[PDB]
Design a protein around this ligand. Structure first.
Ligand SMILES: Nc1cc(C(Cl)=C(Cl)Cl)c(S(N)(=O)=O)cc1S(N)(=O)=O
Ligand SMILES: *[C@@H]1O[C@H](CO)[C@@H](O)[C@H](O)[C@H]1NC(C)=O
Ligand SMILES: *[C@@H]1O[C@H](CO)[C@@H](O)[C@H](O)[C@H]1NC(C)=O
Ligand SMILES: [Zn+2]
Length: 277
């Protein structure tokens, strides 16, 4: 198995235990370096949109690694080109956080760690008919990264937790793995409106847990959405799976990978996007 906190099965081991593909040279997360990135004005505003006809329930599970929101099929989509033609279909959203407020994110922005990084996972429905077809195949996946930052003074309604509908209260010490509960749907469009959806890093990388598949189109928004200390401590109430050394769920993030390890056979480039000025 694998873990975050057991040194025998933890992230420094994955390159050996899961060489396909945790030994690769296109791994994630990376440090997102504003100065050492290429501005590409062709990269458009991201849109998240829902199929109005979908009625199926959303669930959340403590999978032992994270809190994972499981979206029904054919419901939530991403557009990178302004057309609402279902090229990318959202599967799930999960989170990475810290034992303490000064770490938790997988990506860094110029070396800075956020307390909470959310990952919206989608498959390239344009090419592949289902998640199970896309998840192991080339170019199959696109993930959105959303940074969260803690503020002392804020109304609930302008926090990310309004979009999350507080996960219907499931974030607590009794939400043990592998428990799943029905929750209110997540308003992913409202979530995206809490930041600038034109301002993002873009690169080709990997899943950040084994098997670290190098088939992820990454988009990481530079502006964070806002949460309170009370909200970040809700995540810290979840218990880790029995694979972990630590009892409480926290520090569920992979260490930083290089954009171009010395052994790369073809360098990748970190791109940045900004709004049409
Ligand atoms: N796509 C994905 C899946 C999972 C796992 Cl393995 C689940 Cl069991 Cl949902 C997780 S996990 N184990 O919830 O952190 C992370 C990702 S990520 N960071 O987007 O690479
Ligand atoms: C929208 O949801 C309906 C009802 O569940 C479904 O039959 C339809 O295929 C969905 N549309 C897309 C584009 O997935
Ligand atoms: C979510 O969290 C706080 C309760 O401590 C509250 O102010 C808010 O009304 C809750 N929202 C919903 C939808 O229950
Ligand atoms: Zn993730």
């Amino acid at each position: 198995e694998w873990s975050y906190t057991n040194i025998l099965t933890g992230p420094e081991t994955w390159h050996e235990h899961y060489k396909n593909m945790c030994s690769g040279y296109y791994q994630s997360p990376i440090d997102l370096k504003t100065d050492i990135s290429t501005l590409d004005l062709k990269l458009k505003t991201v849109i998240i949109y829902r199929n109005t006809s979908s009625t199926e329930t959303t669930t959340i599970q403590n999978n032992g690694h994270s809190a994972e929101v499981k979206f029904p099929r054919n419901t939530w989509f991403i557009s990178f080109d302004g057309i609402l033609d279902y090229k990318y279909e959202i599967i799930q959203m999960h989170f990475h956080w810290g034992n303490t407020d000064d770490r938790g994110s997988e990506h860094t922005i110029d070396g800075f760690r956020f307390p909470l990084e959310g990952h919206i996972v989608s498959f390239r429905r344009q090419m592949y008919s289902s998640p199970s077809e896309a998840i192991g195949r080339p170019g199959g996946l696109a993930v959105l990264g959303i940074m969260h930052q803690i503020v002392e003074s804020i109304k609930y309604e302008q926090t990310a937790f309004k979009a999350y509908n507080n996960f219907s209260g499931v974030l607590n010490s009794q939400f043990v793995p592998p428990n799943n509960s029905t929750i209110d749907d997540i308003n992913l469009a409202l979530l995206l409106s809490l930041l600038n959806p034109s301002r993002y890093f873009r690169y080709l990388g990997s899943l950040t847990t084994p098997p670290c598949t190098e088939n992820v189109l990454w988009t990481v928004f530079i502006d964070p959405v806002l949460i309170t200390r009370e909200q970040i401590n809700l995540f810290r109430n979840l218990p880790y799976g029995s694979n972990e050394k630590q009892t409480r769920m926290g520090d569920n993030f992979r260490p930083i990978q290089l954009l171009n390890p010395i052994d790369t056979l073809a360098s990748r480039t970190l791109y940045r996007a900004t709004a049409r000025g």
